């Protein structure tokens, strides 16, 4: 029941004990680099829930990202077209901060396979996430039927093609039925299928 106790404990983020621990952790992370290897997961139970195992080939990295909205990249803050495309500073990114951390780590470590990620802290100008990564050429990984599927060549750079959980949510794939019929198997594919001009032999 130990992990049940841990889970119920982690549902109370505003208690004095967890508040103190969070303050200590956020101070500690603020003195380090933006990408860093961890010796072991900071949250064992959440890592287990997301698929982590304690064997050779599983690694954990901590990633930091900045908070807030986005500003367009145009010289002197001038858009030139029609008045409806004139905004500069009030925009919001189309993908979540959790999905941006995986992209940063995947770019930094192109020889590993990304699996999942989870929240670990925030402080008012930053958020921290942890990413689970797999080494696809370690023999323990290659000879295990439970994780073998990630050694296939189609699992290359999953985060670059929006295939992780956060990318899938940004694509609208957590929904089904009414409201989700124009976005599978992808938005562009559905648009292409709905606008094709079919010209049969016996029209």
């Amino acid at each position: 029941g130990a992990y049940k106790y841990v889970q119920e404990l982690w549902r109370k983020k505003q208690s004095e004990a967890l508040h103190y621990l969070f303050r200590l952790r956020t101070w500690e992370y603020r003195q380090l680099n933006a990408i860093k290897r961890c010796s072991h997961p900071t949250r064992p139970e959440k890592a287990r829930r997301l698929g982590y195992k304690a064997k050779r080939g599983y690694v954990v990295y901590r990633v930091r990202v900045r908070r807030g909205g986005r500003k367009r990249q145009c010289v002197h803050g001038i858009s030139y077209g029609k008045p409806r495309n004139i905004g500069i500073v009030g925009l919001k990114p189309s993908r979540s901060l959790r999905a941006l951390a995986e992209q940063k780590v995947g770019r930094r470590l192109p020889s590993l396979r990304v699996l999942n990620s989870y929240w670990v802290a925030q402080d008012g100008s930053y958020k921290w996430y942890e990413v689970i990564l797999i080494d696809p050429f370690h023999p323990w990984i290659r000879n295990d039927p439970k994780i073998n599927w990630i050694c296939n060549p189609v699992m290359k750079r999953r985060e670059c093609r929006g295939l992780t959980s956060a990318g899938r949510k940004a694509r609208g794939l957590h929904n089904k039925g009414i409201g989700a019929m124009k976005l599978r198997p992808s938005k562009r594919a559905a648009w292409k299928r709905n606008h094709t001009r079919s010209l049969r032999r016996y029209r």
Binding site: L199, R201, Y202, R203
Partner: protein
Amino acid sequence: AGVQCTAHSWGPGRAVARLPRKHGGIGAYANFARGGHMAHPTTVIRRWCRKVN
């Protein structure tokens, strides 16, 4: 066919007709120019078959 070159019209005021020209001054693009495209090029979306009850 006929649209792989770079050709633009010179304006009036040089004593030549107003069709598009290549860098050396050769006429291009128009259907009455040597090397140009068809006025209405043939396409495969023409209806080739017919229906009979």
